[PDB]
Each structure stands twice: as C-alpha cells, then as structure tokens.
Amino acid sequence: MELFNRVGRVLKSQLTHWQQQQEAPEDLLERLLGEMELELIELRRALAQTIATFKSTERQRDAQQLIAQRWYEKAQAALDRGNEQLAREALGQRQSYQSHTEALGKSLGEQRALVEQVRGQLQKLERKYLELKSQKNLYLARLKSAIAAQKIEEIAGNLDNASASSLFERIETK
C-alpha cells in the first residue's frame, strides 16, 4: 500500500492519463496520425537531401573528366609531326586523372540503386498512410452509429417491461 497511496495523491492525473489512453480513442487516432505527417515531411526532407548529393558528385565526376580531356587534347596535338616524346609525358599525367574517373565514376553507379529503392519505399509508404486514413472516418461512424444505437434502445428498453412501461403499467395498476 506504498505505491498506491502515491497514486491517490495524483489520482486526478492518473484518471486523466488512463482516460486519454483507454477512452477517447478517436483523439489518439488523430494525433498519432499527426506525427506521421510530421514524419512524412521529415522523410520528404531526408530523401531530398539524398538527391542533392549523387548529382553534386556527378558534377565532380564531370568536372574532373573535363580536365582529363584537356590533357588528352593536349597529348593529341603533341603527337603531331612526330613529337611523340611530348605525347608520352602528357599521357602519364592523364592517368592520374583517369584514376579519379574510375573511383568517382564507379561510386555514382552504386548510389543509383540506393536512391531508387528509398523512393519506392516512400511511394509504398505514402500509399499506406492515405489508405489507413481512409478507413479511419469509415469506422468513426461505426462508433457513432453504435453509441447512437444502444443509447436509444436502452431508453426503448426503459419503456419495456420492468421499467417505464411497467410504470405505464404501475400507473395502470394505480
């Protein structure tokens, strides 16, 4: 009886807590789906951040290869008129830039499937949010239909035997 007298001094708060978790399930149904909205936009922002990196790297790939083309174009002219010695040295510097294209280029192709699966996951994810929210209102009518159904037949039963209809008969017996 030590950790329930503590529940007594805040029984006004515990009653509220249970009432919001057990009763008023429609209230949670609206808020719990609100966090989904905050998360959906967060995932919307998180995804966009991934879209701003793979193409920011493709520019670096396009920027480095552009520099390598100049050396190749330079080496192409060096060979002219039998000046192969200059072409041999000019090509050696191109290999340094060629190693960049292979390393940077291969990484870009790997991220393509990385961004495709995450988007498909979001597309499938968004479909589940609206679908669940569609049936949401369909059921909230059931609760309103049942609560609006039992509460009238309860009074109709109050106008049946052993109640107001018995009072209808009690006044009759009188």
Partner: peptide
C-alpha cells in the same frame, strides 16, 4: 539550388 532543384523533383 541543386537541393531546391531536386526538391521539385520529389514534390
């Protein structure tokens, strides 16, 4: 700008 450009790519 690329991030904002890609932002329209999603929306």
């Amino acid at each position: 700008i690329l991030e904002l450009e890609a932002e329209r790519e999603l929306l």
